[PDB]
Amino acid sequence: RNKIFISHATPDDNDFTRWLALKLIGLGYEVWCDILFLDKGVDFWSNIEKV
Amino acid sequence: RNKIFISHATPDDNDFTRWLALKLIGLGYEVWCDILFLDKGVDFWSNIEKVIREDTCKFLLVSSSYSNQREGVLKELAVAAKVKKQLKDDKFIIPLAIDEQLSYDDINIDIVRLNAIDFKMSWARGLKDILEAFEKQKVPKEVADASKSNL
Amino acid sequence: MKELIYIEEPKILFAHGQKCTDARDGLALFGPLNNLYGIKSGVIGTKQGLKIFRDYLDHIQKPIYNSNSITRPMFPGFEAVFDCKWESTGITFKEVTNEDIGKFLYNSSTHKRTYDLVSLFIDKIISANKNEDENVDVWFVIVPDEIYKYCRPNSVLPAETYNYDAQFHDQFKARLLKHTIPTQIFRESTLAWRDFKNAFGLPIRDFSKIEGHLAWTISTAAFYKAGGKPWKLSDVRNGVCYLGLVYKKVEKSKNPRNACCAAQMFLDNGDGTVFKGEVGPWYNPKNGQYHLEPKEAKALLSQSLQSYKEQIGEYPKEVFIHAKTRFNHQEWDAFLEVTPKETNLVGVTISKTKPLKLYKTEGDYTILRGNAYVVNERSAFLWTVGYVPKIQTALSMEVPNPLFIEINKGEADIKQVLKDILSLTKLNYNACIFADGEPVTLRFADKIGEILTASTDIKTPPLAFKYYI
DNA sequence: TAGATTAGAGCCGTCA
Ligand SMILES: NC(=O)c1ccc[n+]([C@H]2O[C@H](COP(=O)([O-])OP(=O)(O)OC[C@@H]3O[C@H](n4cnc5c(N)ncnc54)[C@@H](O)[C@H]3O)[C@H](O)[C@H]2O)c1
Ligand SMILES: [Mg+2]
């Protein structure tokens, strides 16, 4: 349990979310985001709930 | 395995299928598709099922209006699901979304929980996504040679 | 029962050292020869023109299809073909209000209004160029339809500025020469062909079945103008230099003062391709004559020889001059006095005014492309337009006409002349087509000549082709 | 009066 989840509305708040995710990654933390780490062709609700 | 299977609704999705097959073959991936061979008739099904079940590492489905609820594509998806369960590989079918009319609310049940690659906005972005996914998942490949596609 | 011979396709060279006989397929399979990073565009026009240009750019980032992919290869999108970015965010806008256009396109004298409109556009372009901090690769001029409609020479509306042509495009290109600004003129109806109609509810120009061809053409033009190399020739033999010649009337002057402009081409010794105009318009005062006086012939050939020697390091081993007219003896002697010892000079003539047609007796398709009837050792008929089996169609509609090639001066081999002339039809960068009906040594010289004749103030013009096309 | 070369402009079709 060392991942910071970020919840937002897509795609209306993408700029701030991407900025914040990149900043937190640069500072050293582990970030999971709907627009940068979700896979293509994967069951996404199940993966989100698992995360 | 070493081969990439492409399932599409002939003869409506021919332009994109030819484009994608030529690009992939020019990048070092062996592609099996029903448009690359001019001989048909004998074992119209056996060879296809044998190739899916024996020497296919990736199954790419061209998800569009024509390919939804298409009998041959549905049988292909059934065989692909069987092989995917047999191999214990979670990422084996990778749908490609190329049609703007086909809303995600109206996709087939066999592919409704899967993360699909988007081609609707621009095809180059879709190709970049496919290449990055293949590199990440370690799809076997040859040194890229555009002469294969040319020939 | 005479005899015909066949000449094979010349082939052209693309990225990764791969060869193909089609520019569309070769570019859509391998890619161009060099690497642009992106095209920052500068758009000038009304607000509607800017909107139309943004629409078009957004359109060609995606695949575009023709009705028959076999006849016309598709367009897989700009950034997949060319591996560089040209989108609607590096755009810079410079307004031209309708208030500016209204007060000028009313003088009822074509000359003055043409002058005023050209000034209205070029003053803004030059102001943007000299006193702003951007780096604009090409300038795209969106011309409303009315501006282009009436600025033709012989078209009527239903002294200081008289030393200029009566054409918007020619004067516009000529008056921007000393600034060296690549430019692309667009009609407003070309980019948005759907919304310009007639009294039937249908487009004036219907591009519905040929959209991919239009995208190919525009993309290739824009790519070349920004400093790209789409393709090169395959097996140009070393030591040979080609040289076109074309004469042009001068019109508004006390004397016709026929002007002659050339175009030079050869192999750069780095296995590149040097294709640049060798021009400073040489003149002939006599009316109706299309021959140079000895001094101009001497100067022209000396300049061409010096260009080759500087670009390579030694004089040509063979020089071919392609013209549309015959050469008299005094002109050729002038040429020969200023030519080195170990250099063979051959003068050729290419003409279209000769009635000879061949009909296939069986089908409904025309003669093949590589055919040629060799009348003699110093003449032959060469078909450059005809049925091409690779694309499964003919480049013309009706029965095509051949080119008549004559070795007027010198001593050479007609087979080599025909082969070379056919291979020069594959370097039309103003178009994205399978092949052209004329050698481009004779077509780009004409385009240079017809630009630097709409004015007289140009001195020592640029040679690069991207300032005239 | 002819034959034989030359360059300008303008207009229309591209699919099915
Ligand atoms: N920021 C958010 O709003 C956010 C965050 C996490 C999860 N979600 C979930 O809610 C979203 C709702 O999306 P919407 O319907 O409002 O708009 P939408 O589907 O048009 O756009 C949303 C995005 O579409 C993509 N997407 C949706 N279904 C997909 C599938 N089957 N395969 C591949 N990509 C798919 C995802 O990237 C998703 O974030 C998605 O279903 C899912 O990601 C949203
Ligand atoms: Mg042009």
XYZ file of C-alpha atoms in Angstrom, chain A residues 36-47 49, chain B residues 90-91 93-95 112-117 129 136:
26
model
C -1.316 7.721 -17.448
C -1.335 4.141 -16.086
C -4.593 2.448 -17.110
C -3.931 -0.263 -19.677
C -5.489 -0.628 -23.125
C -7.937 -3.491 -23.530
C -8.167 -4.309 -19.809
C -11.240 -4.637 -17.603
C -10.993 -1.175 -16.109
C -13.589 -1.068 -13.315
C -12.174 -4.276 -11.837
C -8.592 -3.008 -12.076
C -11.313 -1.376 -7.644
C -4.393 -11.860 -19.422
C -3.627 -9.582 -22.408
C -7.066 -9.854 -27.404
C -6.396 -6.177 -28.143
C -9.378 -4.529 -29.868
C -16.686 -5.057 -23.229
C -14.345 -5.120 -20.193
C -11.132 -4.755 -22.221
C -8.991 -1.642 -22.689
C -9.174 -0.792 -26.397
C -6.699 1.189 -28.494
C -0.009 3.022 -29.073
C 5.889 -3.369 -23.204
